[PDB]
Amino acid sequence: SMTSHSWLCDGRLLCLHDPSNKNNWKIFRECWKQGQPVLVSGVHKKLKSELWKPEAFSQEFGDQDVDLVNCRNCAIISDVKVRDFWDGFEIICKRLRSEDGQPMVLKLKDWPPGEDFRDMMPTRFEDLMENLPLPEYTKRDGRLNLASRLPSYFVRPDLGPKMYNAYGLITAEDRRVGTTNLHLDVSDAVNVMVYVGIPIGEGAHDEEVLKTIDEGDADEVTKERIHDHKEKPGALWHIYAAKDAEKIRELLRKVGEEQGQENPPDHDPIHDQSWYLDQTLRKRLYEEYGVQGWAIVQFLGDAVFIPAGAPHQVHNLYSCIKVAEDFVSPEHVKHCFRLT
Ligand SMILES: O=C(C1CC1)N1CCN(c2ccc(F)cc2)CC1
Ligand SMILES: [Cl-]
Ligand SMILES: [Cl-]
Ligand SMILES: [Cl-]
Ligand SMILES: [Cl-]
Ligand SMILES: [Mn+2]
C-alpha cells in the first residue's frame, strides 16, 4: 500500500514518499528542527526525462573547455572538451585511460561554471526548480527560505543550482576513495539524483556495489530497495550532525599526526576537504569519540536534505548526474552568522 513516509537508518532518517504533497511540511519540520537529514523519493517521476540524459549534454555543450579530476589519485586533467567526459559516462571503452592502461574514474569539475546554470540551461532550470520538494524551504522565493532576506552579518549562498557529474567507483581499492571528500556547507542544501548510468564493457561490476553498500554500514530496509523493487542506486553518503563537527576535527588531527602530516594544532581538516572516512575511520570515530552518522544510499529520483553545518561525504556506486540547490531555513540560520 502507498504510505506518506517510512524510517531508514533504524528509525533515525525520515523518508517521504510523495515529493509534491502539500502536507509534507507537517512530517518534515520536527526532524529538520532536530538537525537530521531527510530523504524524499520519487522526484524522477516529476521531471522531463529527455532533458537529463548524458547524450543530450554531449550534443548541446560538447565543445566547451573544462577540467576533470582523477578520483583515484586527485590528479587534475586540464583544458579538455566536455564531450570527452560525457561520451564515456556509461560506455567504458570510450573513457580516457591512465598511464597503466586502465579506464579512469573521472569527476567533471565546476560545470556549468560558477552561477551560470540558469543562463546556460534555462529549460532544465525550470524543470528542476518547479519540482523541488518542500518548496516553501527550497524555492529562491519560498516563505521559509531566508537567503534573499538577510543582512551582510550572514553568509548568503550563491545563485544555484549546481550540477555534480562523476563516474562510479569500480574496484575493491576504490572502496576507500570519495567522489566528494568530507566537508561542510554554511547553508542548507537539497541534492536531487536526476540520472544514474549503469555501464557496459565491464558491465558485471554489480557484486562489488553490494559489498560497498554492506561495508558502508547501510541498514536492512535500504538493502531491500535493490533486491525487491530493482531501483537504480547512485551514490553512498555519510552525513554527521553539525554538533559533532569538532570531534571529527579532533580524530582527523590525530590521524594526520599518525601518518606523518605536520599541521599546526588548530588547522581545519574538514575545511581542507582532503579526507574520506573509510570503514576503518568510521569505526574509530564511533568507538574512540562516541560519534554516529547516517549512512544513506541515494537512488534515482531521491532528494537528500543536508542540514547547514553537517559534515558529509559522497561515494558514487554508478555514474551520477546530481543537481543541488542551497537555501537558508530559519531552523539552521545560526550556522551562517558571522559573529560569536
Ligand atoms: O602521458 C600521459 C599521462 C601523464 C598524463 N598520457 C599519455 C598516454 N596515455 C595513454 C594511456 C593508455 C592508452 F591506451 C593510450 C594512451 C595516458 C595519458
Ligand atoms: Cl543546528
Ligand atoms: Cl536547457
Ligand atoms: Cl513546504
Ligand atoms: Cl572533493
Ligand atoms: Mn557540499
From Swiss-Prot:
Protein residues bound to Fe cation: H183, D185, H312
Which tissue types show expression of this protein?
Answer: Ubiquitous. Highly expressed in placenta, skeletal muscle, kidney, heart and liver.
Q: Which stretches make up the JmjC domain?
A: 121-340
Give compartment(s): Nucleus
Task of the protein: Histone demethylase that specifically demethylates 'Lys-9' of histone H3, thereby playing a central role in histone code. Demethylation of Lys residue generates formaldehyde and succinate. May have tumor suppressor activity.
The family assignment reads: Belongs to the JHDM2 histone demethylase family.
Fill in the domain comment.
Leu-Xaa-Xaa-Leu-Leu (LXXLL) motifs are known to mediate the association with nuclear receptors.
The entry's other comment says: Its gene is located in the 5q region of the genome which is deleted in del(5q) interstitial deletion, a frequent deletion found in myeloid leukemias and myelodysplasias, suggesting that it may be a good candidate for the del(5q) tumor suppressor gene.
| Known disease link | Diets-Jongmans syndrome: An autosomal dominant disorder characterized by varying degrees of intellectual disability, developmental delay, short stature, and characteristic facial features such as a wide mouth, a pointed chin, long ears and a low columella.
Q: What is this protein called?
A: Lysine-specific demethylase 3B
What taxonomic lineage is listed for the species of origin?
A: Eukaryota, Metazoa, Chordata, Craniata, Vertebrata
Identify the coding gene.
Answer: KDM3B
- Please give the range of the full-length protein represented by this chain: 1380 to 1717 of 1761
